[PDB]
């Protein structure tokens, strides 16, 4: 029973976390093999309304870098830059490097955040990439470099390195190829979050978990076809539906089709009335179909 | 910015999880030093029905215990029962045993759950102890023995060992001294759940966090005396507030007093009804004042 936004265990990722310092900057890096990865703004000036990374790199001294894993200092061999990241060759292999890949997360997808400060993990929590390519994180100053990832068995799948905070307080990172998510800039300017929509396919996922837990009071007696819901969605701040059938298992075990849930969704936005749905905004899109199926039955999506 | 129900990093605890098998039956155990601690229904009848634990115990053989830390089977030298736990002595001292301690949590306090299956960590998430000594967790079959803990500056503070799920989906565990939270029984017996009530203290903490984060639609134009609130609260499944102190810093920074928040809580109770507070269900009481101060300012108590 139960449904929790959870993280997967952080042990394997905690071992790769390092403290990178340069000039007036300190943040967190990822140490994999003999390369250390961190946000390039570690080499910026903290006082300019603007960062000239080209300048900053041109005039860089390797002996101004302070990088550590625990109390052990790693020696800087040299630096390369890619997108919003530095890739720092160091003189030591991290023996604790797990098997890993890189992936860029798509909107509506979940992953873990390991929130780091001074090169060590402080908290771990699950998030979901929003349609405006931000996440609703929890971060205070010094968090830059905090990694996001999923663990697929197996392999650590890195998807996020924490870069900045928008004016609304939601946050943005880059993938590990250095591409900023949503096209934002790694500049100290206060940038702005664009319009987002509840990710409908995840709302559906959430409803099924709720039925399965005996949350029923919201359940509509009526039903509504998929595209006719879609035309309502695009002008009601909710995303359209494409994955027809990742709900087959759920629909079958509840005997509640998708159209019925779509009807319930439409009813639920116009608000109430009653209260709880396990919790949970009543209408959250933080849970993917994969997640829900897993906490319901413990199975590879 | 941001507020997230998170977990502390689980690395130090993951290396203490083991598979505990008597026969026959299977669950998770905690391997500290040369002791394995696990729930005692591991020896109990494979589910039909009630457990005469003295009978089960008198008849027990140590070699009917297979205990695997991942790959290695541990060898059982002896066993002692404490409340609803078994403490099993083994051949070897868990090399990675952290500095630890036991503590029993009070209703309305938060801690971490490390959800284990087959003797190893699969998920981690933060919870808060409800006033009827249960927690709203996320477990499915195989989860018994999953530890709950707080990490206080290096020291792992063990406060919870998962024992059972009630008819409601509530979860019940014992402290690491074998004491069943809330007086429940580690029995396959039909069992009832006490009446709970939201911790107003925690709700306040949350609402103050919302303000600090510039979520301010929900905020009342009105005040209500603390006394008057307390009268209403006991008819509406909310705890009374009797100490104002722990909100001074927050009232300071926002300029907004608790009596104004109290009026807001009443108003939100008769629902709201359009959309989120920091991502949640208008209200939640899963956050303490300490939790909130911590994620806002990175500072304790």
Residue numbers in the entry:
A (entry chain B), B (entry chain A): 1 to 301
Lines quoted from the article behind this entry:
The papain-like protease (PLP1 and PLP2 or PLpro) cleaves the polyprotein at 3 sites, whereas the 3C-like protease (3CLpro), also known as the main-protease (Mpro) or nsp5, cleaves the polyprotein at 11 sites. The active site of PEDV-3CLpro, which contains a catalytic dyad formed from residues Cys144 and His41, is located in a cleft between domains I and II. Domain III is involved in monomer dimerization, which is ultimately responsible for forming the active protease.
In this study, we report the expression, purification, crystallization, and X-ray structure of PEDV-3CLpro in its unbound state to 2.10 Å. PEDV-3CLpro crystallized in space group P212121 as a dimer in the asymmetric unit. Interestingly, different solvent molecules are found in the respective active sites of the PEDV-3CLpro monomers composing the PEDV-3CLpro dimer, where the a single DMSO molecule resides in the Chain A active site and the Chain B active site houses both isopropanol (IPA) and 2-methyl-2,4-pentanediol (MPD). The presence of different solvent molecules in each of the active sites of the dimer supports the assignment of one biological dimer in the asymmetric unit. The LSQ superposition of 229E-3CLpro and PEDV-3CLpro shows that the overall architectures of both the 229E-3CLpro and PEDV-3CLpro active sites in their unbound states are structurally very similar, and the active site residues of the catalytic dyad, residues Cys144 and His41 in both PEDV-3CLpro and 229E-3CLpro, are located in almost identical structural space within the active site cavity, which is solvent exposed on one side. We found the overall active site architectures of the unbound PEDV-3CLpro and the inhibitor-bound form of FIPV-3CLpro to be remarkably similar with the catalytic dyad residues (Cys144 and His41 in both FIPV- and PEDV-3CLpro) in nearly identical orientations despite Cys144 of FIPV-3CLpro being covalently modified by the inhibitor, compound 6. The S2 loop forms the outer boundary of the S2 binding pocket and shows positional variability across the X-ray structures of 229E-, FIPV-, and PEDV-3CLpro, which may lead to differences in the size of the S2 subsites across 3CLpro’s.
